[PDB]
Amino acid sequence: AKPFELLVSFLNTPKYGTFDPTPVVPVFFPFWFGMIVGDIGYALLFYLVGRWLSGYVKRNEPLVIDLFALKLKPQVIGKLVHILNWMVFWTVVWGVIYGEFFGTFLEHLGVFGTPEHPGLIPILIHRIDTAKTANLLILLSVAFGVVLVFFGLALRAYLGLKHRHMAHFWEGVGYLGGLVGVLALAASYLGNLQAGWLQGLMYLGFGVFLLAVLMSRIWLMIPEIFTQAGHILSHIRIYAVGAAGGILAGLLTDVGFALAERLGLLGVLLGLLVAGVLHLLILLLTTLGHMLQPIRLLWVEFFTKFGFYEENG
């Protein structure tokens, strides 16, 4: 938990009397990282790199990168290694959750358990089905954002509870009412159209929202409610990136298989090397952005939004 405090420390200092947001990240960020990690075969190389940097740590290397002319601090790197332990764990377990890996023999024999091939090695996600896999892909990333934004607004409201800026405590639960009302309306629209308790939910939602408006006609607050009502929908980008990476890795592995066998006897000994080269280069290109995406999502939507626009000391 303590190593994760470095990433937050880059930003503005909090004010005493506001709660520490550091323990939020180490439990939530790493499994978000895990969703890009159909690539588990190549993350053992990341573990090897962590071993290399731990070798620098036990060497106590004051490393200097010639390319960027940057100075490295040995005591910082151990925090990085203990941080990377958990994302390697989430790496492994999420790649298992995918079920599909490159050693899947279904292109040659029905060994792995799928609806297509009832084998003895059950694979949860074959990445071909789009009927229920899509809905399952949507649902969890929808739910995580809702839970975290509700927690953030609740804790901001409880901070407003103490000091007498409690005037904005009312608008905090007004956001909650507006969100639950629009959620009820949306779920009633495209769903199975049952609307009774849905009508009750939306009624209470916009009622308690309009109650907060009666505090004062704040000219600035009324449009931005729609904006965070889209920021909650912005949480869906998590599975998009992971699906993009996973299907690319799967198709590249299929290209390796095709160059191996589908070329006949002439292509048997060639395709795997260039397939691995393509995999490693595309990972080198992509993994940096894929790593920074969820951390910046939680970092700007939760962490900055709740309490990190205000004073510092």
Binding site: L11, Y189, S234, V300, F308
Partner: protein, 73 residues
């Protein structure tokens, strides 16, 4: 259902693409000024970043319309 599904399909992509363009056209000009401000002063990350995250409120549209109309189909 005859040969019609392509007509419904093509309208989905245009909306989301042009929403992306509308985000990008604002983002290009705002980001340059923001990074120019942050180059001379370290004390403005938050105020710049909140404004850079504002155009992302546009890209949320189109995709939900595509989902609901595909479910309608």
């Amino acid at each position: 259902g005859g040969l019609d599904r392509g007509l419904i399909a093509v309208g989905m992509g245009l909306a989301v693409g042009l929403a992306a363009l509308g985000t990008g056209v604002a983002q290009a000009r705002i980001g340059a000024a923001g990074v120019g401000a942050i180059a001379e002063d370290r004390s403005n990350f938050g105020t710049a970043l909140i404004f850079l995250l504002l155009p992302e409120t546009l890209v949320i549209f189109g995709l939900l319309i595509a989902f609901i109309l595909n479910g309608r189909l």
